[PDB]
Design a protein around this ligand. Structure first.
Ligand code: SAH
Lengths: 265, 265
């Protein structure tokens, strides 16, 4: 009679932690959502096969409006698990569902998994140098989001890197590429003209983190905006000013132009 | 011909991912380091039993000064695994190890696991709101470092949270406690009088993230600086202005005082 929030990891069913697998195997009911992120290297079937249960997938509305009607009831009796891509609380509002659990007299526990937030370390950029993060959202009708642009400006001021989560509309199977995010930003720069993001800005693209062969690329926008980085998910990072070893890693591992070697301290 | 950087996760031997453990079981050689952090919820013996491979442990010098003469040679004619607590490449100096491997003509792959950078999402604080990160270090001799203090100032200044790693003397197994970190910062405040950290500052303490029963506590320094948060390791977080939903979580989950619903929002 408790509820488990269990992360599934970055790419496939194997990025779950052993702790999560053995507990998931012993739960009576298993729920999940696949709208907060995209696990490009697996299927619901493989997850079900690995865990040895039938996973009922929930929609954003089932979760955000009916979590306490669909999932919480069974927890008061049974052991229930709620699976999510990556880490269950990172760049989601699932944390709030812990509070709902509490108000219904249900104990909840969290089992972490590898998250895109810490996986940026594979880019060679010191993770402690990351500043405030932001999400590049798809424009809707007449409304064109731009806050993420200011975030980059603020962090870059301070010499900090900026992590940009990319938008996703899972029900429509839409996953914003880095390419797409770079376009929106040029438009925003063109609209605000702050010299934040231009054809000469250095950016880093990390695609399908968690797989064994993720795409990691660093370079100027003019060069990258049209390059193919493979299937989603992608994220895009706008570094601040670089340490020498960061630049060496970017050149050596991420194929950046050798001349970012030359840092302008 | 292959080197696997495999993360061990947060607290115990089960915090490794299923992908990590299977890859490790198939490696001819397995190395690990416990100088950047320790796994307080387990032992080297229980890690070795779960992997079924003897684990040779490397010191900080072994890694930083002789990675290429201890680990890479073996990786040229065998599959080698290098285990680190948390997520691989989070520790500032580790990414550069991949360059060494490239230089030695060795292929390297990274197998992610849970990191404290993402696992603090369990505190209910929004991840995108975290700013620059820092480490609280012990003063010693004629040296009294205070950069971590300025970090908190610049972050809180911008409404961003500050994640503070506490000093650890890995070899001597000697952890700075959240209590000690608080007093240090109180002492640093008396020095710079910047109005950054005082008895009225609200802070969040996270201990043994990853275990099923972590300790999550939030409150004003004057009430926490002398509270017992249990066994290490401890992580300190000085939040910026809170989103009402964050505050509710800290109150309902981390036992924070009602007062924050109106004072820190
Ligand atoms: N493996 C991966 N590679 C690249 N980007 C990823 C990724 N997994 C998630 N993302 C990024 O993050 C967005 C989802 S945000 C939710 C993140 C999740 N809780 C976690 O802990 O990772 C995606 O739209 C994408 O931009």
């Amino acid at each position: 009679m408790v509820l488990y929030f269990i992360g599934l990891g970055l790419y496939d069913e194997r990025d779950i932690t052993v702790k999560g697998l053995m507990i998931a195997k012993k739960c009576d009911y298993v729920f999940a959502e696949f709208y907060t992120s995209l696990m490009a290297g697996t299927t619901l079937g493989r997850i079900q096969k690995l865990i040895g249960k039938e996973i009922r997938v929930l929609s954003r509305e089932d979760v955000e409006l009916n979590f306490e009607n669909i999932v919480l009831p069974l927890a008061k009796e049974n052991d229930v698990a709620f699976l999510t891509p990556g880490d269950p609380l990172v760049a989601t509002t699932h944390a709030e569902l812990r509070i709902r659990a509490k108000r219904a007299g249900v104990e909840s526990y969290v089992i972490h998994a590898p998250s895109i937030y810490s996986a940026v370390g594979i880019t060679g950029l010191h993770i402690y140098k990351f500043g405030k993060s932001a999400t590049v959202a798809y424009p809707e009708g007449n409304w064109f989001p731009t806050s993420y642009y200011d975030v980059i400006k603020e962090n870059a001021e301070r010499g900090l890197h900026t992590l940009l989560f990319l938008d996703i509309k899972a029900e429509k199977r839409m996953y914003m590429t880095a390419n797409e995010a770079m376009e929106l930003l040029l438009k925003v720069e063109d609209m605000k003209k702050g010299g934040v993001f231009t054809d000469d800005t250095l950016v880093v693209v990390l695609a399908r983190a968690g797989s064994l062969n993720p795409t990691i690329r660093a370079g100027y926008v003019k060069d990258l905006i049209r390059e193919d980085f493979g299937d989603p998910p992608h994220i895009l990072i706008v570094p601040g000013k670089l340490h020498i070893v960061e630049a060496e890693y970017l050149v050596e591992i991420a194929g950046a132009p050798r001349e970012i070697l030359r840092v302008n301290v």
